[PDB]
Amino acid sequence: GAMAPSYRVKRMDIAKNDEECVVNAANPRGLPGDGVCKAVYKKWPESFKNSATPVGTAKTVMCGTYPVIHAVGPNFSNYTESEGDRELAAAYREVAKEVTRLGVNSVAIPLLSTGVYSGGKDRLTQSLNHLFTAMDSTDADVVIYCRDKEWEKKISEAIQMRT
Ligand SMILES: COCc1cc(C(N)=O)no1
Ligand SMILES: [Cl-]
Ligand SMILES: [Cl-]
Ligand SMILES: [Cl-]
């Protein structure tokens, strides 16, 4: 475990993370995809061997000794708000199980279902709150990655609010 488990946020490419493992915002078919998933494919392509997994699950594949946790959030274009919310919460619960099983002291994680799977809605708060629900009981240092300057400020504020 980390000596004083923390949350932090950084605005940069998650493929340049300084953590002991990474969470990919994967598609269910283990395809290279776009956004976070394409960056992850370019950096760790060996981790896409048999990485296909259903919505609401996470599947870990090693790139050398570096773990890539493929977490599949729902595409809110296809799911109802209700069913999508349940699957987005479940994906993060499976991430916490994998992070625990791997024994890592730190994890880089993107906000699942906030990009092309968002169904055109701002889901910062929804996705971040499901992240916290899952990861609060783990003792890994969590570093959240994003692209947008306004999102960095809002994620930082939400972390600081809990102290
Ligand atoms: C905010 O989604 C766009 C995005 C983020 C990234 C990344 N590499 O973290 N690539 O595309
Ligand atoms: Cl960058
Ligand atoms: Cl997304
Ligand atoms: Cl972002």
Q: Helices 124-135 & 149-161, crossing angle to 10 degrees?
A: 40
Of the listed ligands, the closest to the CA of 44 is 1
For residue 44, how far is the Cα from the chain centroid?
Answer: 16
Q: What is the resolution of this structure in A?
A: 1.4
Q: Reduced to 3 states, what is the DSSP secondary structure of residue 74?
A: coil
Pocket, ligand 1, Cβ cutoff 6 A: 13-15, 35-36, 39, 115, 145, 147
Determine the Cα–Cα distance for residues 144 and 92; give it in Å rounded to an integer. 13
Token pair for 112? 């699942």
CB of 26 within 8 A of CB of 36? Answer: no
Structural domain containing residue 56: 1-163
What is the 8-class DSSP label of residue 66?
Answer: E
Tally the domains of the chain. Answer: 1
Determine the Cα–Cα distance for residues 135 and 132; give it in Å rounded to an integer. 5
Determine the Cα–Cα distance for residues 84 and 60; give it in Å rounded to an integer. 22
Distance 95 CA to ligand 4 centre (A): 20
38 CA closest ligand 1 atom index? 10
Determine the Cα–Cα distance for residues 15 and 12; give it in Å rounded to an integer. 9
Burial category of 160 from C-beta neighbours within 10 Å (exposed 0-12, middle 13-18, buried 19 and up): exposed
Experimental method: X-ray
Q: Which uninterrupted H or E stretch holds 158?
A: helix 149-161
Of the listed ligands, the closest to the CA of 34 is 1
Determine the Cα–Cα distance for residues 104 and 28; give it in Å rounded to an integer. 25
